[PDB]
Structure 1
Amino acid sequence: KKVAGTLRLDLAAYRELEAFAQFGSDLDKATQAKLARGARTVEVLKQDLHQPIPVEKQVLIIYALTRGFLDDIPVEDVRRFEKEFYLFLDQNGQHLLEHIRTTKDLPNEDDLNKAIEAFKKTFVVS
């Protein structure tokens, strides 16, 4: 609830603004910033057949997109960034995955922000 309740309504707004922007000639800064997050969300919602994602891993990848850490990564890489984060969570970040399951609740923001920056150092691009 805390992570993603404004996603359904905000994502409809990108659909119209993309349709206008293709025929549009010159856009402004607040329209261009909205166009950059919308593309990542559409690639974060792409899945593959017969591969379900556990709910604790869902809330962690969506926290990255809503809080804006995924803004740095170029688009085609988003799908691989998502497979890698899930592997890393498994190998390294076990404490975050224990808290969400028992309390159905999100951990301390400092510890989560620390962890996502730590993954982003290890990740490489193109």
Structure 2
Amino acid sequence: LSKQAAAYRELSLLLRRPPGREAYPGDIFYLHSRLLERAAKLSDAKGGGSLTALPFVETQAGDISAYIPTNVISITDGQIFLQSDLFFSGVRPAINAGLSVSRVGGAAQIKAMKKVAGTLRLDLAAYRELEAFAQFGSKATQAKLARGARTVEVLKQDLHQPIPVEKQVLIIYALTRGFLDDIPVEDVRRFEKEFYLFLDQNGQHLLEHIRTTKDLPNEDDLNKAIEAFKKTFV
């Protein structure tokens, strides 16, 4: 979407409209907004439709303080910045949990997710700040370090294999409960898929319950699939 500005620059400069900060005329805030405000969840007086949008912005070497990036940040209900030096660390797409927050988040979830994400943050938000300096010095702190390593390993995904929401919540519950940290670091990418293959041959009832009621099933019965798998994992 940033290319808009370029075209808007060209014509505006050829039309002899007065310049601005970086030759961007001041209308940018108007020009973007006159579009980006049109996404909404309409009421019943007109119609029960809904619309969502994902604008894209170009950036030069991560200079987030630039004109257009800060211009567009103000409008949106959040931000997902993609960071390049982490793009080669293994996590793809390169979404960083530090710079990205959602103001609307916490409500638009299936209740199976809300019951667990807190512990996921209680590992990840500590790891993503401690790892850069605390990794060198070799019980609770090293346990936190190892757990965080396995979490940042398990969030990765291979090229173009979308997963339904139910398997996402199943694996997030598997990770957070502490049953997953015995598989070693390199084999996690295999485990996360062979669980996916195991669940179907174990049963569909959990999957059906999450599909219909949008809520976590009975934990006493949920744990049994994990227990049965771990007895046969290789």
Inter-partner Cα distance in structure 1 for 2:208 and 2:184: 30
Structure 2: stretches of 5+ with no match in the other structure: 1-113
Distance 1:62 1:34 in 2: 17
Work out the CA distance in 2 between the residues paired with 1:69 and 1:105.
Answer: 21
**1:30 and 2:140 matched:** yes
Give the drift of 1:112.
Answer: 1.0
Partner of 1:82: helix, strand, or coil?
Answer: helix
1:32: how far off? 0.6
TM superposition shift of 1:57: 0.2
Please state whether the residue corresponding to 1:71 is helix, strand or coil. Answer: coil
Partners of 1:84 and 1:14 lie apart in 2 by 27
How far the C-alpha of 1:115 sits from its partner, in A, is 1.5
Q: In 2 relative to 1, CA 37–23 (structure 1 residues): closer, same or farther, beyond 3 Å?
A: closer
Shift of 1:9: 5.6
Contact 2:135 2:145 in 1 (8 A): no
TM-score normalized with structure 2 length: 0.48
Give how far 1:60 is off.
0.5
Contact 2:154 2:189 in 1 (8 A): yes
- Give CA deviations for 1:44-82 in whole Å, capped at 9, x if unaligned: 110112111110000001111100010111111111111
| 1:16 Cα deviation after fit | 2.0
**In 1, are the aligned partners of 2:116 and 2:176 still within 8 Å (CA)?**
yes
Contact 2:210 2:216 in 1 (8 A): yes
Cα distance, 1:23 vs structure 2? 4.3
Segments of 4+ moved more than 2 angstroms: 5-10, 22-25
| 1:33 positional shift | 0.8
Select the structure that is richer in helix. Answer: 1
Measure how far apart 1:108 and its partner are. 0.8
Deviations 1:18-62 (A, max 9, x none): 11223446xxx1111101110111111101121111100000011
Three-state SS of the structure 2 residue aligned to 1:63 is helix
RMSD value over aligned CA atoms?
1.5
Question: Which 10-residue stretch deviates more, 39-48 or 6-15?
Answer: 6-15
Percent identity reads 100
Q: Distance in 2 between matches of 1:9 and 1:71?
A: 16
Report the 3-state secondary structure (helix = DSSP H, G, I; strand = E; otherwise coil) of the residue aligned with 2:187.
Answer: helix
Q: Which has the higher contact order (CA 8 A, sep 6+)?
A: 1
**Paired position in structure 1 for 2:73:** none
SS at match of 1:85: helix
- Bigger CA drift: 36-45 or 12-21? 12-21
Report SS of the residue matched to 1:34: helix
